[PDB]
Swiss-Prot record, chain A:
Recorded GO MF terms: metal ion binding; transmembrane signaling receptor activity
Species assigned in the record: Homo sapiens
Tissue specificity annotation: Expressed in T-helper type 1 (Th1) lymphocytes. Expressed on regulatory T (Treg) cells after TCR stimulation. Expressed in dendritic cells and natural killer (NK) cells. Expressed in epithelial tissues. Expression is increased on CD4+ and CD8+ T-cells in chronic hepatitis C virus (HCV) infection. In progressive HIV-1 infection, expression is up-regulated on HIV-1-specific CD8 T-cells.
Record family assignment: Belongs to the immunoglobulin superfamily. TIM family.
Protein name: Hepatitis A virus cellular receptor 2
GO cellular component: anchoring junction; cell surface; early endosome; immunological synapse; mediator complex; plasma membrane
Residues binding Ca(2+): 93, 96
PTM info: O-glycosylated with core 1 or possibly core 8 glycans.
Disulfides per UniProt: 15-87, 29-40, 35-86
Subunit relationships: Interacts with HMGB1; impairs HMGB1 binding to B-DNA and likely HMGB1-mediated innate immune response. Interacts with BAG6. Interacts (phosphorylated) with PIK3R1 and PIK3R2. Interacts (not dependent on its phosphorylation status) with FYN. Interacts (in basal state T-cells) with VAV1; AKT1/2, LCP2, ZAP70, SYK, PIK3R1, FYN, SH3BP2 and SH2D2A. Interacts (in activated T-cells) with LCK and PLCG. Interacts with ILF3; this interaction promotes ILF3 ubiquitination and degradation.
Physiological role: Cell surface receptor implicated in modulating innate and adaptive immune responses. Generally accepted to have an inhibiting function. Reports on stimulating functions suggest that the activity may be influenced by the cellular context and/or the respective ligand. Regulates macrophage activation. Inhibits T-helper type 1 lymphocyte (Th1)-mediated auto- and alloimmune responses and promotes immunological tolerance. In CD8+ cells attenuates TCR-induced signaling, specifically by blocking NF-kappaB and NFAT promoter activities resulting in the loss of IL-2 secretion.
Domain of life: Eukaryota
Residues the entry annotates as binding a 1,2-diacyl-sn-glycero-3-phospho-L-serine: 88, 95
Amino acid sequence: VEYRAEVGQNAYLPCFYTPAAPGNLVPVCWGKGACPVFECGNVVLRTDERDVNYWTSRYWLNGDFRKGDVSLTIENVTLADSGIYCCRIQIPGIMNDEKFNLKLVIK
Amino acid sequence: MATETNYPVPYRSKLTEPFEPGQTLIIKGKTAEDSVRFTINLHNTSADFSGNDVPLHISVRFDEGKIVFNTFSKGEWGKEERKSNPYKKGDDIDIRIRAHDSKFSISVDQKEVKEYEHRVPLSSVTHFSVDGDILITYIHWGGKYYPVPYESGLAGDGLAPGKSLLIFATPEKKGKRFHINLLKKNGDIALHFNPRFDEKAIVRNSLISGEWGNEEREGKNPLEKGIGCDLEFRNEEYAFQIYVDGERFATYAHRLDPHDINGLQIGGDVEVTGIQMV
């Protein structure tokens, strides 16, 4: 759902998948909106299955991020970072995506 | 019924590591008289998929010049071709794999000629076996990708006293200098073991307090660059036996000591195809 935090504190956007394989690498919806195949607009991040591909201090992960924690506990947030966020779980298999249109705004 | 001193024959060895490519798949020793086929089975997963298209099935048929290439595919025996394996009944067998994620180097007539390709994700090989009557001095399956150069160790002895430990380095097709060494943990040159097939030899030299010794060289060695080498260092009840390609390379006299000359240094491009247990 929608969560709030302060400057530099812990955000959350609840969405989790499973780590697949070193040969079945799959990205995630990260950005803002609805990523049908791929665009919930203004895409800001992608991750992977067997590692965590791309995450920053401004796009931050406090949990166990290598096993599929792509719930971005966003550190040092501005309002330009805030808004609706792209997150959707691409389950391995055909036609099984769950699109979350979830707003995570931090002051 | 010749010099075994390792195992009551026939012998099998389970996996030393989970599969990362950069290994050697090893039947180096002698043969029995009933080598008709084996079952070296290297079977596939994707993640834990357990049943996809399979990287390897290996068996030799001891007459006329190959090792077989074969697969599983969702629970059935794949393409098993009828031809045979060159060496005559009495002498050696040498399966010597340079393992990539795209080639496993099959060796016949003591020299690798054919490469057998992977198709699969990275960590996805979980099996091994042998079938039939066989006369084993060593079986090993393990290793990984080592970035070039690296610094690591060789496990226990180098040349195994009372046993035979076979020494697995990478003569690479696209490398620079090719070795795993037989020295101590301090880093000196005690027996700088070099399957350097850019230099096309197995060189071993000994430094004992500023004095270099015999410089033991020149044994059988018809093998080729592009191999995962199996370089056989026995210690029998009667002598210290050094074999390359299943016949005796040299004899290990005391220059520096036996009993855990097992020091590894890696320089240049050698994508190591073995660090091995007993």
